[PDB]
């Protein structure tokens, strides 16, 4: 149960925490400027802005630039969340987390220039294909398991796992984007946030909660990859919440019994029985039957052959992304909210 493999991981995470803390306590600020970048096309949106494909004019490399509107962030009381986002993201470093390359701000906006992950959202492909075979889901699930092992070891909760936030890179692996609700926390926290289908019961019930919410959200993810629909759905949020707290799941008849067993233990309503939140931690997931053919180190090093490589014609190609309406990026001549985002 405990061998030298488990000690190899403990040594790596201990070193990764050292790296993370240096960057956590001394974050990078103001590493570029708006007009170092040609703005091409919107790859997606959110409540306070959008991500755009961009070309760094002096290196010619492509990036994805998040743009947040300071005034809107303030209007909606989401300052501390957008501060965590940048702070967490410039500090982490794992093969399945989107690299934050540059960040800066001007009078109206916050900017996070990330690596461009050209394969599109896992969401897009999952809806198109309908569902993923178990081997295909496990390939992706394994990468979330390792990524959570990293993040939780650093005291981070992610809190918004969904296919919409997993992007596929040129070699067919996941990069996690969207750290908008990621938080460093020792102990419990209480904010009602996340995506309705993926919210753990303890979140819905105002009970206060921990890392374990991310392991519930993985059960949902694995289920939705495998079934093609999430285990609790309904037209409006409230009905999804009712289904989630009842703790009744039905499985499609094609799910293997191993998968059913894994999922009944991730979708445990009881915090004390949930895989991930027991004494062996993540090792109860990794040592489960469903993952018995998973070479965890092979997954970390990216030498497993991916079941699906997205077609990319060249750098700057946006065919794996939906189209959105473009807005011009206005920059006011007076400073919006300087005190509030001064650490950004």
């Amino acid at each position: 149960k405990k061998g030298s493999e488990q000690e190899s991981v403990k040594e790596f995470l201990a070193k990764a925490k050292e790296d993370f803390l240096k960057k956590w306590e001394n974050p990078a600020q103001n590493t570029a400027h708006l007009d170092q970048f040609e703005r091409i096309k919107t790859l997606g949106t959110g409540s306070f802005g959008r991500v755009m494909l961009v070309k760094h004019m002096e290196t010619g490399n492509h990036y994805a630039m998040k743009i947040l509107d300071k005034q809107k962030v303030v209007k909606l009381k989401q300052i501390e969340h957008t501060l965590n986002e940048k702070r967490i993201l410039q500090a982490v470093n794992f093969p399945f987390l989107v690299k934050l390359e540059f960040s800066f701000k001007d009078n109206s906006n916050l900017y996070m220039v990330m690596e461009y992950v050209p394969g599109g959202e896992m969401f897009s492909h999952l809806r198109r294909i309908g569902r993923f075979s178990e081997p295909h889901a496990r390939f992706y699930a394994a990468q979330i398991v390792l990524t959570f092992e990293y993040l939780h070891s650093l005291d981070l909760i992610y809190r918004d796992l969904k296919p919409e936030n997993l992007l596929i890179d040129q070699q067919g692996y996941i990069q996690v984007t969207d750290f908008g609700f990621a938080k460093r926390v020792k102990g419990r926290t209480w904010t009602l946030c996340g995506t309705p289908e993926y919210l753990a019961p303890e979140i819905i019930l105002s009970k206060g909660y921990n890392k374990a919410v991310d392991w519930w959200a993985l059960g949902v993810l694995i289920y939705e990859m495998a079934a093609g629909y999430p285990p609790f759905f309904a037209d409006q949020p409230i009905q999804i919440y009712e289904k989630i707290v009842s703790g009744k799941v039905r499985f499609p008849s094609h799910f293997s019994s191993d998968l059913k067993d894994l999922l009944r233990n991730l979708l445990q309503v009881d915090l004390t029985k949930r895989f991930g939140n027991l004494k062996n931690g993540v090792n109860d997931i990794k040592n489960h039957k469903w993952f018995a053919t998973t070479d965890w180190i092979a997954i970390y090093q990216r030498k497993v052959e991916a079941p699906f490589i997205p077609k990319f014609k060249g750098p700057g190609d946006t065919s794996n992304f939906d189209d959105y309406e473009e807005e011009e990026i206005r920059v006011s001549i007076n400073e919006k909210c300087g005190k509030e985002f001064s650490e950004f």
Partner: peptide, 19 residues
């Protein structure tokens, strides 16, 4: 079927988070 019911639901699109 449950797939059909999901496909006819209002929640097959990109799902926003709440706060």
């Amino acid at each position: 079927t449950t797939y059909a019911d999901f496909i006819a639901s209002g929640r097959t699109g990109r799902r926003n988070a709440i706060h």
